[PDB]
Design a protein around this ligand. Structure first.
Ligand code: MN
Lengths: 98, 218, 342, 343, 98
DNA sequence: CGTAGCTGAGGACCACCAGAACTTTTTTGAAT
DNA sequence: GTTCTGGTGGTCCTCAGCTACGTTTTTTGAATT
């Protein structure tokens, strides 16, 4: 469907293995998406990639210790997105002339 | 009516009376107000552009912000946004500095240029008020539009002055009578900031008696 | 045209309400319980001993957010009323009309007509879809009697005759209202009215529903700009919300009793929730109160279409728009106040 | 602490107030300050961020006692009431009287007599205090004229005649207004009144003070349940507290002109605190406004005695108590409203 | 009306007035919505409140140093939000009995 | 060169404490 | 009891740095809802 989704995490690093969980979660979530803010990623995925990422990521985090939220906008994401500061991000609809 | 100076109406009523005759009645008689996105943007822009106690000059001309003005010919008082004074030995001396300067009223509003009079009338009012204080004549005005970021010139003629006087008389009569009129709805009252209050719907529908009888007898 | 903002009901005893910016915070002996934005709330109902700082009351009463206190069973203990506004034209017209008997009769006729029309429509609706389980012929005869006395009410000219006709309509409607025990056992049988002590079932629900209707009608009347303590009907006892009662006299037929009857028929609640003290009349439990309020709030969000306006809006906006429809009439924008004829 | 006319005023900020048995108990950080009976109370007024106790709120609501929460500066915050709301017959009687000329003129003459008495006594006291720097004969003549005017106004029955007498009295006081100043005459001169875009310095000053007093008066009415926006002499208009203006007429002079004259005569503020405008109008500077507000607050703490009752009260309670008396005139035992006749 | 809006900020605390900017942004964002994770807020607001909040946040923050992103999920926010972790967020449409 | 495992080194983000205060006219403000 | 400004302690969070090695059988996976 090629729809834009956004993922936020919040892992407790004061536990026994918080640092390793943070590292694995960040590494796994960076593969499927592009970082826009600290602990806030956005990506363009279908239903299949979204389901695969959700299944992969629900096994790395530990319940009753972490938080993870996933939002989806839709095919019209170009309207419901606003940037005001000085942290630009690459748009995956650009011809990408590097 | 303490000294006849308390029976004054604000300049803001003129534009409201020009656009939607019921809008002025709701705003200035029933004391009601509701804000939408455009109203918030305009209010924020005007508040940011309201910088008193300071004067900006370029050696020849001068600008004054938030100028309190009143007029007894129309019994209308208010605050002008910007008044510009240009250096030429033709007008009348003003207090604070030396020389003779001519005056031009400029007010900022956010939006496209409107086919209706509206804005123009308000500007004309300011001119009258201004020429009641400095004892001179003003034959020019400027309008600044922020949506397109442009400046538009406006001449002043006798017809505009007569129309302003007539509308001021009508406003005074309506305020004396405490009457809220009814105006044609059209497509205007879709962005009415008081649309949830001025209720354009029940103007065109059937009488209350007919609906009660129809729902009552069967 | 509004959004029908939510409502907050606090039940824990010995709570405390404080203000932080545009947020309300619930504290209890320096232990926080939660915080909610104040731009998504309309009414705050406290149960038992709940305190509020003067800043919160001043911030709420200025922005048309009502605050109500109930002891345990929907009593009228105390409300929060703020300052006035600069719409003296409306209050002047309202008092001038209230000082005149003819206009008060003109409004009372519409009130009673709406009430009895709603009652007749509800009775016919119930008679329509139900099988022989109910007495269809007696209900039809009562509906015919109500429709006949309808036109007599429509052409009234005094408060006393209208009051007598209202009393007759109330007796006639109660005579057939005594019947609804359809999908419940005999413990929920109506046995008359008991005003202060809710000594039986159903009545303990009816009183709470009436209190919840009054606390909303008064808030709406205060919000719209009218004065909710001078009425166009009823014997004008000083120090009562006469206008609120006059306005809810027509909405009580579908907004309070219908809710109780539909909750009884659906068997959402059962008699085990209610209990009795040594005398104690009949009192609800915490779970019963929670279920009642959950069902009430869930019902308040169903969307209907207004008869007069012909526009689609939520159920909970009905008590407000009506009051607004009064105010416009007080400015000469209509011929007479159009009542609710659902 | 002080209770007056079956009402309880708690003026000190940040003081807890709760219930104990059948009495009201004041607290201040676990310190028991006082205990008062509640049997004969009619209303309770708070002036701090207190909040009271829920039990006392319930008790007062059950016993038909209305709690009023006001801020320390006198603004109206909240009014907790039971089923009665208190002001029903009061407000209905106010509306009924407001639409008849005779009772309105009676209340108007009651206000105007107090106004002229206050002005005349102020002039006489000032002339007695400073004989050298004052043209005594002119003040004596205007005092006799004001006395005759008051005697005539005590026999008036029309709104137009009362308005004319008030206008002539204002003209006389304005033509005398300049000379009570005694210092820094270089820039502080009175040459007329213009409330709208004020001109020539000191006038603008006066305007500000007036506004503050008016606001205070409004709160007083909101304390007693009266409607501040429906006047008796002044004709009601949307957005203006006409009855507050009517009530402040007697209190305008000694509470505004005295304050500004005391500010000027002690050189508290100087023309350096005012800015300039090209049309001849003047505006206040933020530091000057803050100093003005601080001086107003300090003056509000001055303690005097009430001419009619004699109880020692601060100035801030003067506008409120008077309003209460007005309410007691609308329904009560008072034959007529007693004005604030203070020597 | 009454749509869900999500706001993410990212201020720089290594500058001169970073702490003050962070405090003011947090106070201005807590006045309208709730907090689900650090440096992210969600609210149920209409269009006028959204415009006012956007104007306030734009006027408060400083450019070329801070970051601010605003997304809107529309009126159908119930079926688009997914939560897996253990940081529940109070809903503002249920009966909300405390 | 790529993928895992450990450090360490500062920026972000929020929660507590402590001290000092808490009052301002009237006017403007959208409409594809 | 709010509101504002400091000051501090503790926790998320990303990057730069340093060592220490990189191979893995064939079979099984949803669907009309
Ligand atoms: Mn402008």
């Amino acid at each position: 469907g090629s729809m834009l989704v956004l993922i936020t995490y919040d892992v407790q690093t004061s536990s026994m293995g918080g640092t390793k969980r943070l590292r694995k979660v960040a590494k796994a979530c960076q593969n499927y998406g592009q970082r826009v803010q600290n602990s806030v990623f956005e990506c363009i995925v279908d239903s299949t990639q979204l389901t695969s990422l959700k299944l992969e990521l629900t096994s790395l985090i530990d319940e009753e210790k972490d938080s993870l939220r996933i939002y989806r906008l839709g095919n019209n994401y170009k309207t419901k997105v606003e940037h005001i500061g000085a942290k630009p991000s690459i748009d995956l609809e650009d011809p990408l002339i590097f | 009516a303490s000294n006849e100076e308390d029976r004054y109406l604000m300049l803001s009523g003129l534009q409201h009376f020009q656009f939607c005759k019921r809008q002025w009645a709701l705003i200035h008689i029933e004391q009601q107000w509701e804000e939408n996105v455009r109203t918030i943007e305009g209010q924020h822009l005007h508040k940011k552009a309201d910088q008193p106690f300071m004067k900006e000059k370029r050696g020849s001309k001068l600008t004054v912000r938030a100028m309190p003005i009143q007029s007894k010919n129309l019994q209308i008082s208010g605050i002008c946004d910007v008044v510009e004074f240009v250096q030429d030995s033709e007008g009348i001396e003003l207090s604070g500095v030396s020389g003779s300067y001519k005056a031009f009223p400029v007010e900022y509003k956010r939006g496209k240029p409107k086919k209706g009079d509206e804005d123009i009338v308000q500007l004309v009012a300011q001119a009258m008020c201004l020429e009641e204080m400095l004892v001179c004549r003003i034959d020019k005005g400027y309008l600044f539009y922020n949506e397109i970021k442009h400046r538009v010139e406006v001449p002043i003629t006798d017809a505009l002055r007569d129309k302003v006087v007539q509308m001021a008389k009508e406003m005074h009569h309506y305020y004396e009578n405490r009457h809220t009129p009814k105006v044609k709805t059209g497509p205007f009252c879709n962005n009415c900031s008081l649309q949830s209050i001025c209720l354009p719907k029940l103007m065109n529908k059937r009488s209350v008696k007919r609906y009660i009888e129809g729902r009552l007898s069967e | 045209m509004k959004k029908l903002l939510n409502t907050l009901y606090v039940t824990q005893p010995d709570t405390y309400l404080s203000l932080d910016g545009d947020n309300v915070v619930l504290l209890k002996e320096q232990e926080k319980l939660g915080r909610l934005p104040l731009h998504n709330l309309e009414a705050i109902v406290g149960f038992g001993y709940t305190g509020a700082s003067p800043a919160l009351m001043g911030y709420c009463a200025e922005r048309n957010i009502s605050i109500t206190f109930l002891t345990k069973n929907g009593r009228f203990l105390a409300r929060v009323v703020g300052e006035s506004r600069g719409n003296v034209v409306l209050r002047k017209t309202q008092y001038r009309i209230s000082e005149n008997d003819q206009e008060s009769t003109k409004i009372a006729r519409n009130f009673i007509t709406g009430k009895v029309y709603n009652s007749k429509w509800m009775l016919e609706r119930m008679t329509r879809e139900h099988p022989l389980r109910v007495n269809v012929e007696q209900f039809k005869a009562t509906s015919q009697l109500l429709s006949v006395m309808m036109q007599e009410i429509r052409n009234c000219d005094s408060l006393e005759s209208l009051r007598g006709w209202e009393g007759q309509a109330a007796i006639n409607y109660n005579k057939v209202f005594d019947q609804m025990i359809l999908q419940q056992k005999e413990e929920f049988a109506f046995h008359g009215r008991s005003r202060r002590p809710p000594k039986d079932n159903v009545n303990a629900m009816l009183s709470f529903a009436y209190t919840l209707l009054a606390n909303d009608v008064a808030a709406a009347l205060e919000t719209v700009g009218l004065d909710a303590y001078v009425g166009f009907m009823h014997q004008d006892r000083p120090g009562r919300a006469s206008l609120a009662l006059d306005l809810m006299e027509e909405l009580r037929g579908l907004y309070a009793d219908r809710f109780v009857l539909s909750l009884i028929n659906r068997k959402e609640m059962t008699a085990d929730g209610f209990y009795k003290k040594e005398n104690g009349a009949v009192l609800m439990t915490d779970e019963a109160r929670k279920t009642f309020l959950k069902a009430w709030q869930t019902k308040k969000q169903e969307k209907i279409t207004h008869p007069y306006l012909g526009e689609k809006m939520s159920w909970g906006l009905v008590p407000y728009v009506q009051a607004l429809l009064l105010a416009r009439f007080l400015r000469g924008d209509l011929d007479e106040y159009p009542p609710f004829l659902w």
